[PDB]
Subunit: 181 residues, 2 copies
């Protein structure tokens, strides 16, 4: 088992995909992450199952953070997008709660690209609005681990997947009478 497969397999991390480590091997992708997560190299090795080095517990955390931040970049590359598109087709991220979006499958998104500013939310292509995950096992995931441009990039590479707009809409009525507004 890889550190990564283990992570992505944990409960609450259903929204993540396994980042190809080739991507991680290209130092050019990790630009500026070093000046962002504590124990950078120590955490980077841990993610790569490389040599460790006394509560080396706080490391796993920075490994999460690091992994998380890398993920946000990865899913902008075609492979990442492909892996995510697959989880999309599997409904891994849930479906739009809005009644008239008829369970349109959602995509994970971040309200900010800066860490620790907001927990990952859910985007609906149909709606084009963002919602809060119904599960709580997802109320501790940083939106920054997904970013703000991911959902868009995906659809701006796979347009055939964009949904047809809602054939129906909510129409308020008191007794069969359309109330306005």
């Amino acid at each position: 088992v890889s550190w990564i497969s283990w992570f992505c397999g944990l409960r609450g991390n259903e929204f993540f995909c396994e980042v190809d480590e080739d991507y991680i091997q290209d130092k050019f992708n990790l630009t500026g992450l070093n000046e962002q997560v504590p124990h950078y190299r120590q955490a980077l090795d841990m993610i790569l199952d490389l040599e460790p080095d006394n509560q080396s517990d706080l490391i796993e955390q920075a490994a999460e953070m690091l992994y998380g931040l890398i993920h946000a970049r990865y899913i902008l590359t075609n492979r990442g997008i492909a892996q995510m598109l697959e989880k999309y087709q599997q409904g891994d991220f849930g479906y739009c709660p809005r009644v008239y979006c008829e369970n349109q499958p959602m995509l994970p998104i971040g309200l900010s690209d800066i860490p620790g500013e907001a927990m990952v939310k859910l985007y609906c292509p149909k709606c084009m609005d963002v919602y809060t995950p119904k599960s709580s096992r997802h109320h501790h995931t940083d939106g920054a681990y997904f970013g703000t441009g991911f959902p868009h990039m995906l659809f701006m590479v796979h347009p055939e997947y964009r949904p047809k707009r809602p054939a129906n809409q909510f129409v308020p009525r008191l007794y069969g009478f359309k109330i306005h507004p």
Copy 2:
């Protein structure tokens, strides 16, 4: 425990309120329900606790449910519901920018067996599907289509201030 209290207490019936039986005693409220639910009077007694055809029940629920939809249009009903609203009994709007605005139960139709009860957001003014599954077997008709409105059109002070914020898509800090 009274049948009604028993019912409203079951799991999955958190959205219901206890209908004052005085209301039930006025035959004028039950107009046309008799030609809608099977074993009408048998089911009506059961609801009032009056002394495998455990179907006399399936209809008690239906009947109760249909009565409920009417009840919550009366001030008492509205009051009891408004209370459950203040308690968040119906959940909050999933929409991120509605900042957990508490919702109200609603029906997409007043006709039975046509759609399961959905959730209305005053802020949003849109309807959503309950996140729990224990609510995916409740008829919207037991709540009706005009209830949320009636409530707010009697308790305006409760209408929410519109969203101070909105979703703004961006690729890299760039509104797109």
